Every structure is written in C-alpha cells, then in structure tokens.
Write a protein that binds this DNA or RNA. Structure first.
Lengths: 431, 443
DNA sequence: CTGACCTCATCATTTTCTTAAAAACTGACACTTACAATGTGGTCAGTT
DNA sequence: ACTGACCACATTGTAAGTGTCAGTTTTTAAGAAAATGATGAGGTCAG
C-alpha cells in the first residue's frame, strides 16, 4: 500500500543519505500537492517514520533527520511403552468435558506448584496404593523428572556428594556433569546395594531404586533397608531419595510396599514418574518432600510458575478421579504379562547359550550371549539386520564384561510380531 | 480369630500374620518353618495358597528357602534406632474471545486410534514441522533471517534461560534494564553470576553507560519497554550492535514482549534483522498472545552457538508435549493464527480507547505516562498519599491494585505511580471497576 | 521310606468386553450483513 | 503566510452469521466372556 510505500520511499533517502542530519524533509502540506498524493498519506508516512526515529520532529513542525532413525523395522529398549492399546476414546471424552467455553479462568496460570485437585488425588492414590504417607501440601509436581532433580540440586547446594550405582540408568551422571558436584560409584549384588560400603564411607545423598533395580531387577530385602534407614538416622543432614521406576507391574506376588513407608523421622523423599505408564510423551512427574525440607522449599521457590500445562493437569485429574486409571493399568499389566510369557517360552529352547538373568516383573529382559563373537559385531549385525538393539556396556562405565550381555525390551514390538522379531534377531546372530 | 469375611484373601491374611509374628520377634534367625504339607494340613488350607504366600514372602526377603529342604528366616530385627473482584495484571490475556471450538477440531483431528507411534517421545529439538512453521512465521512477520534448525522449544522462558546460563558459564556479568520486569535478577539470585543495574530514560537504554562498562551480556526489549513502552531509536540500536561487535565474548539477548500488537505503526522490524555479525539471540513467547497457561516458548541461536548447544545438551528431552506441539503446528499451518491475532488486536484497541476516554475527565490529579501500544497503562496519582495506603484502600473495596514499589529498586517519584492492566476485565465492567476504585480512593 | 521340590485338572464369584439401534453431534456449501481498512476531500487552533 | 490535527464519505473485501443438510460420532443396557483366588491330585528328586 502507499501508506507504507511512501514510508519506504523516503526511508531509502534517510538511510542512504540524500539529505544529511538536520535537513528538512521535502516539505509539509506541499509534498503531497507536488507528488499529487493526498495529505493523509503523507501524514501517515511521516508518523510511521517518527515512530522508528528515522526523522526527528521539533514540537512545532520542523524535520531533523537522524543518522528417531529413518530405516528400522524394529527397535528394542525398556523406554518404549506399548502404545496401540491406549484408550484414545476415553481420553477425548474427558478432554471435551474439561475445556469448554463456559469454563473460562482456566486459561491463566496459577497455583505455582500445581492444581490442588491434582495434588489431592495423587496423595490419595499414593496412600491407598503404595502405602506412602503424604499430605496435599507435601507434594510438588513438575514436568519431567529432570526439572525436579535440577530443583533439588539448586535447593541443596554445590557442597554435597552423590552416590550412583554403576549398573543403572545413565541420568545422574549426565546431570552432575554440568554441576560442580561429584559422584561416587557403588556396586550392587543380587540382594541390593552395598549398604556396608556406604556405611563404610562418608557419602551424603545416594540414588537408589528399591522397588526394582534397573536392569537386573533385584529387590532389596528388609534387613538392608533397615540398615540404610539406621545409616540415615545417625547424622542430621543426610537424605535418601526413593525412585518409583516401574512399580505396580509385578505379576505373581502383588507389588512390594515403597520404602517411604518405613520412614518415620523424615529422611526419605519420594520421587516418581508418570510417563512410563500413560504416555511416553505427555511429560508429567511428581515428588514428595519431608515436612522441614518441603517447608523450606515452599519458602524458597515462590516465584516460579507451574511447568506442565494446566489443561493436562485438569483433564488427567478428571480422568483418574472417576477410576479409569485402574482399568487401564490392569489391561496393560495383562498384555505385558502375556508378551513376556510368550517371549520367554520362545527363547527357552536355546538354554545352553542364553541364560536369562533377572525376574519376571518389569518391561524388559537382559540376556547373556555365550557365543565367541564380540558385542560390537553383535550390535552391528543387529542394526544391519534392520532391527537395532542396545547393549548394556553403555549403562555401566566400568570394565566391559567378558560375556557380552545385551538388553532386550518388548514394549514397542506388536504382540503378533514378537516371534518373527525374535527369529530375525537370532538368525542375524547366526544360530 | 480369622474372619474369612474381609475382601482381602487368605493369600494376604496369612502373610500379615506371619509378618507380624516375625517382626514382633516370636520367630528367630535360622528357625525351621513347617514347610508346605504340615502347615497346609494344620490350617486346613490348600497347597496353592500356602506356596503362593511363602514364595511372596521369599521374594520380599523375610525368609529364604533352600531347595528340597524347609524355610529359614533371614530377618533379625532391631526395629527402629480477601475476594478479588477485578484483577489487575499487565500479563493476562482475554478468555471469552478465545475460539475454543477451533481448538477442539484440531485436537480431535490430531489424536486418534490410527495416530499411534506418536505417544512415544523423541526429537527434543522439536519436530521439524513446528520448527519450520515457526521459522516461516517469524521470517514473514518480524523480518528475522534464520534457518529452521537453529530454533529450539522449551516450557516457558525460565527453562530456556536456565539452559542458556548453564551453556555460557558462571564467569560472565549480566546486564538488565531499569527497575522493571523482575525476572533476570530472580533467576540470578540462585547462581554465582552477578547483575549490573541500569537506568533508562523515556527513549530507551543508556547505551553510553553500556559502552563505558565491561558488562558481558545485557538484557533489554528492543520493541516495547516494560512498562514505559519506549522504543529504541536506530542510532542507539546501531551503537549497541557496535558495542557487542567491539569485543568477541559479549552477547545481546532480544526479548520481544508484545511486538505484534502495535496498532497503527504496522510492526517494527526486530533487532535481529540488522544483525550481520551474528551477535544477538532471539527470545519469543506463545503465552502472552494465545494462552497464558499452556507454557510454551521458543528461542533462536546463531550457528556456532547452535553447534555448541547441540553438542552440550544432546541428551535432554523437551518439556513441551508432542500433543500440544503437533496440534498447534496444525493450528498455524492453515493460517488461523493470523485471524486470532487480528481479532485480539482489534478488541484490545477498543478496550484501550474506551478506558482512555473514560479516564480523560479526571486529568487534573492524574496523568498517563504510557503510550498507545501495549496491554497496560502507567498512571501517577498526585493525591497527597503514599502508594501503600492506596493499595490497602483498594483492598478495602475488594478490588486490589499492584503498585510499582516492587518493580523499583529505587524510589522514582514520591507521588506514587501505579500500573493498571485490562486484559481480563470485560468491556461492560470497565466503567464500574474504575468508578469503584476511584470511590475507594479520595475521588 | 517319609520328606520336599513341583503341573495339571476343573470349580467358583465378580469384572471386562462386544453388538445392536437411538441419541447428539459438527463440517460443507451456501448466503445474508456487517465493519473497520485505506483513501480523498475539506475542514480546524494556534504558532510564527 | 506556514503548519498544528478533526470531521465528512467513499470504497474493497475480510470477517461475522443463520440456514438445512449429509454425515461421523457418542450413549446405553443389555448381552456375552475373559480373567483370578481356590480346592484337588497328581509330576520328579533329594536325603
């Protein structure tokens, strides 16, 4: 339009320098007549110019110029949950129920921790499922476990030591790489972590997964748990973090109570996750904190907002306020149990070479290969067979184990393709 | 003793009994259990339930079984040892004008049974679609020149700023605007880094003080200055760009607050447009325009800093859900964003004109410092009373207001100056709101 | 030989799953009205 | 005499609206049917 065409047509002379600073622009009320353009167009162009300060105007009118991967048939790892059996038509029914024109004032942020209903529901569910004592005020909610962990890191300080078990999930190493703190490895036997090693050391906060040990699946006894609680009881400024990795997926023996139940003097914090059950890409997590530390955190981090969208909070609290969470959880448990039974029975024949180690509960198995080939050749053959696999040597930074044990997960593989996938992998290995 | 009437099966009551007997201390270390047959006969129960309870006990660790022999306890216990009627933020966006029924259609179009293989996460940089449409929108609305692969996505501005802080280092010295938007100081209050406060006049940041000091990175808004609405001139922009160019380890960050709501003067080109030396990083927002509660944002980087960010944070995962990301990609793909933006622009212009015209009459004791563009206006009360008394009297009539005392490190003017916003006040209530607040005050 | 590891059988109560018709829904083309955009023309107060 | 800003009214065309319709979708009380806690009677193998 001419409205800004004149603006550009004159801006070219101010920028290029047809007239220097202080020189008058061609005219006022006369340039319009000479160019035949209407006066209003000139007025608009000059106002646009003085908006950006290309030309400065004296109060009385004078013009002062200014100077994942592309080709994979399959992939194996415990991260990928199964996705086909998600009841979309049950999610949409609550979504269209929660976001309606009538219900405004849910589009603006508030309750910096999270929606009060969501916190109350989480407290009730945790207390009546995992035996975890809690309070509605006690819980905090954020998006991704990473943000909660970084909040904890900034809350504690840069003057503490962290204990990470060597065969484990490569998270705390990657977080502590950036931060000043340093980590101390710890080996783990078939009954738990080397609590004797910890009590023979001056570590302060240690990262453990009592319910199920990634990836070997070992379950901590009561004696070692009691010893660890007494170890935390000794001093006044030591804390133990409990990670709820993959509970509620145990088949035979119900499920094991969480370590937070044993806490009586407030030295255990309950960390959890929410995106390895419902959706891998919905990004909700949660955390509980002991009364003094939670009170301090409330008094310390007032100015942050929530991190996960309020829409998701409301829709999901309405989703599992009615009770569909139990139904979905049970259906997933059944399908995963059947998948695991089929895979184990299929692989049972090659028992001389493949010793399955671990326990049934979980979403994955770890298998040791007694063949003479090297693990690099194994993974390269798997990828060259259009079915990539993820070895365990990356999950532990110590010396590579001579028997190359390769991790296998099956959440991604469809129920009807399990046998074909296993057959293709084993044919690739040359059996 | 045993009810048999509780919903929990004997498969659990037997466990409860044995657990309380072991933990109370009536069975010691290494003691023999009655195995399966004897206990099953004595308790007139099936073998299956007994073996299930015993195997479950073994799994949790109380007792250990040696094959073809009896159980043996492995559990030696030492036991322990008032009523806000009219909100006033210069941050709220209107709710009623929001087309929900256009959101719903895209939501139902994107998430279906066929659309699996999307619940699984990935591409923490953001799927190439969302990036390419956001880059195209920025290029054709703000004159910003950057390929799609530079941009990133994160949940809000705070997370992006924390990632940038970790990426750059703790040795730098940061610069902020005048007493104003209280974000960077609140973030740096927890980090070793330090900030150098500044003063700005009615035209913009004093670039001379910048060039006479050795600050490393300085934070300011080229398009609209919170809360005075000042616009930086071309001369000061050029001088700031030269100052950033002068050294080789100094960066300028650009934060456009509401640079798309300029009513008359089209859209002022963004500072990134003039950068040819690759020294500015763009910071935007999707939450001061569309929804203030979905928590989305975006940010742009130059090529070497892009490589550094790629090599440094390659093992994170985005905090923005793929559901919202894809549905909003579809939202802007067909052009509905422009229509929504225009509608909001027009309604906000009407609201501003109405409120200004209403406030015109009482010009004797009050003034208007803010300019036309923006979502809020700054006024001074020349009544002989302190700001805190005005705020508490505002509370006294169930209509609270938020002054500039918290915004200001110093004391600007003894006659209090107070910020008012109108994002969440309906059109047919502005007159009543202003009337009741003026009644609460001396007028 | 009594002692203890184990695998099927088939019984039961109470939760999950499937099919139809009857309900409310919302995309597609259509058209009737607006309405704020630029734009021209002709004013205005008050300087100097 | 040189130039502040405030009306008129003209135009194109995007946005705003009600209309009946063809059309995918949602709700319901059945129906049926999977699964588990439970009783039974066995399989081998040791010492």
């Amino acid at each position: 339009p001419l409205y800004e065409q004149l603006y550009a047509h004159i801006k070219t002379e101010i920028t290029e320098g047809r007239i220097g600073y202080g020189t008058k622009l061609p005219s006022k009320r006369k340039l319009a007549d000479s160019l035949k353009l209407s006066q209003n167009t000139v007025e608009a162009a000059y106002e646009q110019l003085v908006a950006e300060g290309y030309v400065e105007v004296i109060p009385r009118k004078g013009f002062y110029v200014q100077a994942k991967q592309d080709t994979i048939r399959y992939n194996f790892h415990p991260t990928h949950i199964d996705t086909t059996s998600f009841p979309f038509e049950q999610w949409r029914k609550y979504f269209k129920q929660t976001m309606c024109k009538e219900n405004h004032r849910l589009l603006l942020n508030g309750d910096h921790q999270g929606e009060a209903s969501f916190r109350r529901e989480i407290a009730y569910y945790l207390h009546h499922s995992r035996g975890v004592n809690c309070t509605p005020e006690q819980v905090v909610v954020g998006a991704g476990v990473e943000t909660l962990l970084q909040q904890l890191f900034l809350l504690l300080g840069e003057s503490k030591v962290y204990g990470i078990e060597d065969p484990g999930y490569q998270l705390m190493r990657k977080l502590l790489s950036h931060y000043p703190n340093d980590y101390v490895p710890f080996q783990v036997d078939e009954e738990g972590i080397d609590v004797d090693s910890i009590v023979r050391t001056a570590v302060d906060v240690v990262y453990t997964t009592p319910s199920r040990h990634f990836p070997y699946g070992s379950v901590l006894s009561i004696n070692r748990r009691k010893q660890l609680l007494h170890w935390a009881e000794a001093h006044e400024n030591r804390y133990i973090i409990e990670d709820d990795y993959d509970s509620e997926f145990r088949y035979t023996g119900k499920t094991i109570p969480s370590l937070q139940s044993m806490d009586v003097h407030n030295k255990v914090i309950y960390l959890g996750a929410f995106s390895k059950s419902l959706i891998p890409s919905v990004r909700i997590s949660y955390m509980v904190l002991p009364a003094p530390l939670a009170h301090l955190y409330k008094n310390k981090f007032s100015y942050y907002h929530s991190t996960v969208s309020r829409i998701d909070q409301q829709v999901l609290t309405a989703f599992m306020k009615q009770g569909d969470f139990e139904k979905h959880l049970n259906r997933m448990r059944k399908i995963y149990r059947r998948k695991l039974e089929k895979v184990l029975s299929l692989l049972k024949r090659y028992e001389d070479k493949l010793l399955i180690i671990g326990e049934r509960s979980g979403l994955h198995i770890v298998l040791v290969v007694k063949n003479g080939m090297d693990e690099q050749t194994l993974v390269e053959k798997a990828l060259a067979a259009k079915a990539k696999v993820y070895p365990l040597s990356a999950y532990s930074l110590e010396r590579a184990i001579h028997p190359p044990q390769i991790v296998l997960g099956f959440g991604s593989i469809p129920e009807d393709e399990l046998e074909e996938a296993i057959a293709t992998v084993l044919n690739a290995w040359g059996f």
